[PDB]
Amino acid sequence: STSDLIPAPPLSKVPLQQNFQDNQFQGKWYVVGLAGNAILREDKDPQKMYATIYELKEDKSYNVTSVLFRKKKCDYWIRTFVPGSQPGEFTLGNIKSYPGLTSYLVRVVSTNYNQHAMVFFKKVSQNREYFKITLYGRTKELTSELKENFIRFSKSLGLPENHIVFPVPIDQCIDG
Ligand SMILES: [Cl-]
Ligand SMILES: [Eu+2]
């Protein structure tokens, strides 16, 4: 394999939501925007919206379930976000169960809990460093202002426009 990636930003360029409220962040979020060094706009076959549900466990980790519509079916992808060094950061539980994965970080960049969130992810897999930012909405649509803010923020982390995608709203799988 050969591979050329935009470098992950230093974490000093990634804000952390002040006074993160883990209980209020729970529930379903729609992925309204998606950007990252391995994310590519594809006009031919556009990315479909998917959803990610955060459930706070008794131990204060999250069970995180993502639901995607692929090949006419609902695909479920489950992981555990374990609280990290400060509130609003997380690491991946059971990292040994993911082959090639040596590092995984989540940082909630901003949210008002009941409409929108921006979340930064960074991982090292097969020794390659990937990062993405998701724009989450409690609904499938968000204002132009929030989408443009997400574009500006993604660009501030070094991502050009073709690495920034707005998944198309769908009704299958993600409406339950
Ligand atoms: Cl608007
Ligand atoms: Eu992933």
Swiss-Prot record:
Source superkingdom: Eukaryota
Family classification: Belongs to the calycin superfamily. Lipocalin family.
Gene name per UniProt: LCN2
Protein name in the entry: Neutrophil gelatinase-associated lipocalin
Matching CDD domains: lipocalin_2-like
BP GO annotations: acute-phase response; cellular response to amyloid-beta; cellular response to hydrogen peroxide; cellular response to hypoxia; cellular response to increased oxygen levels; cellular response to interleukin-1; cellular response to interleukin-6; cellular response to lipopolysaccharide
InterPro entries: Calycin, LCN2/LCN12, Lipocalin, Lipocalin_CS, Lipocln_cytosolic_FA-bd_dom
Tissue specificity comment: Detected in neutrophils (at protein level). Expressed in bone marrow and in tissues that are prone to exposure to microorganism. High expression is found in bone marrow as well as in uterus, prostate, salivary gland, stomach, appendix, colon, trachea and lung. Expressed in the medullary tubules of the kidney. Not found in the small intestine or peripheral blood leukocytes.
Species of the source: Homo sapiens
GO molecular function: enterobactin binding; identical protein binding; iron ion binding; iron ion sequestering activity; protease binding
PROSITE patterns in the record: LIPOCALIN (PS00213)
Annotated compartments: Secreted; Cytoplasmic granule lumen; Cytoplasmic vesicle lumen
Purpose: Iron-trafficking protein involved in multiple processes such as apoptosis, innate immunity and renal development. Binds iron through association with 2,3-dihydroxybenzoic acid (2,3-DHBA), a siderophore that shares structural similarities with bacterial enterobactin, and delivers or removes iron from the cell, depending on the context. Iron-bound form (holo-24p3) is internalized following binding to the SLC22A17 (24p3R) receptor, leading to release of iron and subsequent increase of intracellular iron concentration.
Assembly, per entry: Monomer. Homodimer; disulfide-linked. Heterodimer; disulfide-linked with MMP9.
Pfam family of the protein (one): Lipocalin
Record flagged with keyword Signal: yes
Glycosylation: residue positions: 63
Induction (record text): Expression is activated by the oncoprotein BCR-ABL; BCR-ABL misregulates expression via the JAK/STAT pathway and binding of STAT5A to the promoter. Induced by insulin.
A cellular component term, taken from the record's GO annotations: extracellular region
Keywords on record: Apoptosis, Cytoplasmic vesicle, Disulfide bond, Glycoprotein, Immunity, Innate immunity, Ion transport, Iron, Iron transport, Pyrrolidone carboxylic acid, Secreted, Signal, Transport
